[PDB]
Amino acid sequence: AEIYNKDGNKVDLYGKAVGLHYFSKGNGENSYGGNGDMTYARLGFKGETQINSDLTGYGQWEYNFQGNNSEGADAQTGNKTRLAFAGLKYADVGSFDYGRNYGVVYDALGYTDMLPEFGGDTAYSDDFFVGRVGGVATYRNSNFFGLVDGLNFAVQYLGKNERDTARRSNGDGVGGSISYEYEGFGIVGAYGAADRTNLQEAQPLGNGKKAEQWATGLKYDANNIYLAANYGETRNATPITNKFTNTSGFANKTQDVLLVAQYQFDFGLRPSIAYTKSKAKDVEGIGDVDLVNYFEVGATYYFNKNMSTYVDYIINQIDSDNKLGVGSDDTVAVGIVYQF
Amino acid sequence: AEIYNKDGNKVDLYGKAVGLHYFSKGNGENSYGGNGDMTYARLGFKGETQINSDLTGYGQWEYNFQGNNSEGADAQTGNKTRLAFAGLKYADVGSFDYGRNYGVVYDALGYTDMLPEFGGDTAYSDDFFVGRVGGVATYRNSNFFGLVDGLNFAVQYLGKNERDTARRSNGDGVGGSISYEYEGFGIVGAYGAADRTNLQEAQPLGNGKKAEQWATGLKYDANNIYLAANYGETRNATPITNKFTNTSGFANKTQDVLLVAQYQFDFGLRPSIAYTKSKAKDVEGIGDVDLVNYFEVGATYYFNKNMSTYVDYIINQIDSDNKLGVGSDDTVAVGIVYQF
Amino acid sequence: AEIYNKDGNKVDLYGKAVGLHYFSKGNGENSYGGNGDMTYARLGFKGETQINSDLTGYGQWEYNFQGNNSEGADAQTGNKTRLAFAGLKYADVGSFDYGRNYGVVYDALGYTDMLPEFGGDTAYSDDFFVGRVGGVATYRNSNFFGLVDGLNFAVQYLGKNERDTARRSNGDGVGGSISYEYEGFGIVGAYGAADRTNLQEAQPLGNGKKAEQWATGLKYDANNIYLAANYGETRNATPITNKFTNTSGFANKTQDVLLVAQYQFDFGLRPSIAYTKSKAKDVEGIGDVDLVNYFEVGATYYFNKNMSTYVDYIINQIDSDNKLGVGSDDTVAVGIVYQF
Amino acid sequence: GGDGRGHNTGAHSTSGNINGGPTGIGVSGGCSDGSGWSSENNPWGGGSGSGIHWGGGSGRGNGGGAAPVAFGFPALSTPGAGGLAVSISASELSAAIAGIIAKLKKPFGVVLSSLIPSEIAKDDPNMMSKIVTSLPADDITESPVSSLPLDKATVNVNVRVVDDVKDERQNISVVSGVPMSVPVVDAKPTERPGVFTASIPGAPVLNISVNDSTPAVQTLSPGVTNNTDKDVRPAGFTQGGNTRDAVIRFPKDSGHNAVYVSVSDVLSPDQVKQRQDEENRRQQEWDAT
Amino acid sequence: SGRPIGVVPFQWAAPEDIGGIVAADLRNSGKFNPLDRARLPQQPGSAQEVQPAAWSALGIDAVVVGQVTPNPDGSYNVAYQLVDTGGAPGTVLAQNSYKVNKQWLRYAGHTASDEVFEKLTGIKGAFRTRIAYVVQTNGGQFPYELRVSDYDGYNQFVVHRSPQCLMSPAWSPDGSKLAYVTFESGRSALVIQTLANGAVRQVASFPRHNGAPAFSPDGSKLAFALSKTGSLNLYVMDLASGQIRQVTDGRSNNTEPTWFPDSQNLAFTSDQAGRPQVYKVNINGGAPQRITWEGSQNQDADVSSDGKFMVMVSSNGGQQHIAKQDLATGGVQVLSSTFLDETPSLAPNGTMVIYSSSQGMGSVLNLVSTDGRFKARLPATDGQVKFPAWSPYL
């Protein structure tokens, strides 16, 4: 909500609480998502200020706190800062920001990530360009300098991050994304390329230095309807873990397909359907395998913008004989949300 | 304070800062509470929204940050999320919430927990129903559907939590609580029962599976006066630690007695008195013992609702020969509070 | 920004986001500051309330969240609470506060700490009186009871803190500070003395018990100009680390000199210059050495109070042959800030 | 880092509060008597508590923020950087060891334990672990340690706990039968309450901790056996070649009895064949002389 | 309904519409129906010009005419004549002429309103009287104002501004002082402020609410409610000595006193019977008697100046409205039909009641004639208006 809008400065504090639970057969080790209480609250602030008629500056920050944890040593587990960046928006040329923000590729993957709780599984966090990461400098242009309506393009540089684990580390990277919105229809295409650090190469899985991602997205949103289809291909970018070997690394090749179809009703209802799939190829010692292959069937009741309830039933089509130990069981999640 | 009350939605940001210190003889190992600086700040947001005349939705979240810690590796010690839940209140039938919230039994134990800093020692956190825990679904009825004034009853289900330690873990549980308020007087009764996980049974102390708590509370509040008396009995529910053995677990049986008497003055003063006791029975190898047995003598000056000062002197009656290493020393605490 | 100013109570939520980066030759091990992304967001609340015409109470809290970290196990690295205290300001006698706050000596060192990002290196955190620490009780007088204008004096007691490491620990301490502001010119003098804990003495470096700091500060601020010169001397107070030995401790003696000269322009610009030096003496096995010796050359564009950009180039004059492994390389930092 | 901005020295205050200062919290409910029947209480109040209760009450539930080894039973202590960790008890030594020492009173000795590196390394692969043993000094020494000059560094003893090499294993055992005498060292206290640091020449820092609270225990480790056969046998010529013992005394205002402690190295099998060899050569000598 | 009457525009654009003010005054009382200006048979500028037959034909037996002329000093002379057009056609029943400064032109109208109303009714006029009330404005520093205006809402001025809750202003019987509740100290206080100089007398600051002031008609006493004993009970202060006596003492609740004409009895609201009802008690002999038995709830009573009736807020079957109860019969007549009808106040002549309602979402006060015949909104204020109080004769 907008709490302070004065002196040519406006602040929108946005925060929410989510009472959530995941049900699954058994203890929940083999469940797609898990099992138990996953309640969480997020807090964040967005701020803008028109320095001039043609120039405004903005800053945004978001944090996530988990309530499922106890008050002991595990209180901080799952607690983090999602977004923390700043930037400036000129009148027409565009806008430039820096900090910890979503990667350009997520823009394409944004179309499918409309599900209540699950969705966007391919868009892993702390990954090169698919998810939200720290150390990015992004420039964005709206309507190509106002020349052509609906054509927004952006570019992003990724500063190297040398962390303890290859899963969370990266290096110098670049990327771009284009989006054309016409008459309700929407099309997008994004590409990102970066260099893997030595720690990443040292991992048993994964081979090569150029970690590459790219994606194409299509959608149509209107008349209380939302259709979306994202097809993405990557090399040495997707993380993979083997329970049998208890060893992790990255995928030599990956194809990902996401499809979403949601209808909305006047009386605060929104049924949703989602298909998903991700196939890894040229895996070291595992040939080709499917990481995720499932259907979604869910719904969301919107009492209002600030209050909502939702359910999601995940029909995991993954087979038990999978050569990586990926969960071959179904799952369900039920959530309630308040947000200001 | 209420910062945003618009569009049929209202937000009350509530946060406070507490400059606190604990004094005790010696280093403070044997002190009841401890010794040193215990300053802490809490931040939280509550939000409501009347979806309809008869239906409103609410969400609440609270976090605690400790200032006593340094800026090094120990910054996060004692930092946590206390409450994080949501729920809906219908006009008359009642209200239903889910998340991380107080257990039904705390309602009874709420009467005694009116002290400035100490108090409610029996109401441990991350315990089955006595303190605030994650994974509860609670329903509450006010005035029994509006039929009888002052009679509020509630019921609570507790989803299982499989954590690393038995102290913070639990299992499927159920509980209920009833409260009758008449002419200022108040009476309450709460009961909770759940199953202990295998990890809990494996502990050296404790025996049995049905972890049971129950409590009865009485009070009278009026004329600037507050009297309260809570008697609670539990089986395989209360945690216990042995310094001599350096081993922990739960109490086969426990009786707890709490008594509070506070007077309030027009000129922002509130002297308080509190008696407390907890006796464990059928302990493995220790027979029957007293965990806590002390008097309180304290006071609180209320400059206003948003600013307060307080003092509490804890006369620990515990003897040194106690067979668990519990502190047999007195203690004192002095605190100053700002809160919006 | 002031969000709630009602019922004789006023709340100023202040928070900011900083997109930052540090550039340096090589990986950045030898760089003065470091290298990579150092983006961070701070959130805090200040609150006041006039209980009476002559009496008001205030509470302040600040926290720092780092965005450079990932969402894995290292999310909390560098996350902390800077300030968390409370206190009361009487009409004329002065004001008294307690909690986690700046030490009296920082007041003198405040003059030089006007740089955009770097500066105030001598004012280490969790140190006795130079930086912000927990467990202080401070009293302050403004204009010596209103008798003499511009003469503010304060006194501070430091409760002992027994932490795991000597770097973050302390003991009982005392200190005082005086500040005379006349016609734009400003003069200050601060002194602090405390006892070192046994853990501190056990360290290989450092000798003696009385950890002593003191400082003298001069400044002139007017006409869009800010000049400042702080000279401080300490015994057994400054921390020091030896990479060659991989051993730390404190400095038997230290002299520190800080000089700042900043000019401001009407068109939102602020060039800055800073000289700095710190020399340790009577070091155990290293004789006399220079910890830091560098120039600053930087600038800051103030789009407005809520939005700013800045740059700082650190000319490290330290030589490579330094007998402690201190970085002998230059550095640069570029930052962008939004703040409400 | 620019924190100095502002940060005025002296009393800190803002400017322009909206309302005049209230006297206190005497009127809690509002600008009302608290009564509520007529329109004097809650004549302005609106939407008082429509929401259900959320954590009603203060909520400050609680507050912000060495089992002893029996005397005479050799056990492994892995060292730390701060030295070895040992925790003694007050309870006097069991019938077993008193028995042994009485029998032995009237160089020979009796084997307490036997060592097996194969096993000891399963848990302590580095082979850093030592073997500590402790007796109450008075049961060893004829002249009580109290009634002893502070100048004496070596008190005489009637028995000692010593490493021996017999039947192809190293073993810890109680020796006696000749004039013997061991180091006497004072135990400096430490930060911790009832926790001291004895330092015996040639061992690590032996930080002790008295405890007569926990019931005494006997630790059981796959390497260290408890040889039932307690016959008195002749002892090693090389006895003690990897052992350091000492009577340690506490400061007068502690009330802790003086304690004897031996700390023996765990020999590897090569070093045991070596000790065995030297022992056989010395037996040869003694046999010819 | 009401007596039909001809009210003629005054002979002069004129600085003020005196005829319109007289018509509006007479109408607000409920007792008169000024002839629609568009249907007047003539607009005589003088009594001589009145043609009685043309007014009697329309059922009008009296006609108000007058003249406004400017004076050399910029002031104005206002004159009125009341011409019989009934049994004494063309005769002037009453008349006057007098000099006022422009800023009293509206007062001039009320003066005429006062006389004709009395001439034709025999009742003293209350059109030159004033009302007091509390406004919660949208200003930040002093959101609470105790204000006074003319009875019809014109000529408003502020008597006191406060950053804290104000309640329940009350006029001294001479119209020179207002008692009221002020919370500027952070809790309740009862004070008397002198309008002429704004001086504030502190009346009571007991530990809890000090409220619902009422001046005795003779001016010697102030009634109010204190809960220091633990609950609201009635107390009276002798204004000469300042001594406080308690009038009610018991577990029943007694508050919102209003004085009877005798300055010895109070009517007030009590929950002794459950839902609020009106009780009567002597300020000396304390034993309250319930006097309201109609409806399901009765509260907020005001005793008439002759003591024959009171007005109050009554709840009958869900509907709360301003009602009038005859004090010697108990007969209740509902007067108002607005929503959230609250805080009525009677004119000293018993002919009009001012009260607050949902009108203007709280920002408007309303007048209703005590015959029930006329209802109107007052001019809208720049805030929320509560606690209206009708001055005594002024």
Author numbering:
A (entry chain B), B (entry chain C), C (entry chain A): 1 to 340
D (entry chain D): 3 to 67, 85 to 125, 132 to 314
E (entry chain E): 33 to 44, 49 to 430
Question: What did the original publication write about this model?
Answer:
Single particle analysis revealed the presence of two populations of ColE9 translocon complexes, one where the translocon was intact and a second class where BtuB was absent, which we refer to as the partial translocon. The absence of BtuB in the partial translocon, most likely due to receptor dissociation during its deposition on grids, resulted in an improvement in map resolution, which varies from 3.7 to 6 Å (FSC). The partial translocon is comprised of OmpF, the IUTD and T‐domain of ColE9 and TolB. The partial translocon structure of ColE9 shows how the IUTD (residues 3–67) navigates through the lumen of one OmpF subunit in order to thread back up into a neighbouring subunit. The end result is that each OBS is lodged within an individual subunit of OmpF: OBS1 (residues 2–18) is bound to subunit 1 while OBS2 (residues 54–63) is bound to subunit 2, leaving subunit 3 free of colicin. By contrast, OBS2 spans the eyelet of OmpF subunit 2 via a kink created at Gly61, which is enforced by the hydrogen bonding of neighbouring residues, Ser60 and Arg62. In addition to these interactions, networks of hydrogen bonds lock OBS1 and OBS2 of ColE9 into defined conformations within their respective OmpF subunits. Importantly, rotation of the ColE9 T‐domain from the full to the partial translocon repositions ColE9 from a central position above the OmpF trimer to become localised above subunit 2 within which OBS2 is bound. The position of TolB is rotated by ˜50° between the two structures and in the partial translocon is located closer to OmpF through a ˜8 Å upward movement along the axis of rotation. The positioning of TolB closer to OmpF in the partial translocon structure is stabilised by additional interactions between the periplasmic region of OmpF subunit 1 and the IUTD sequence immediately preceding the TBE.
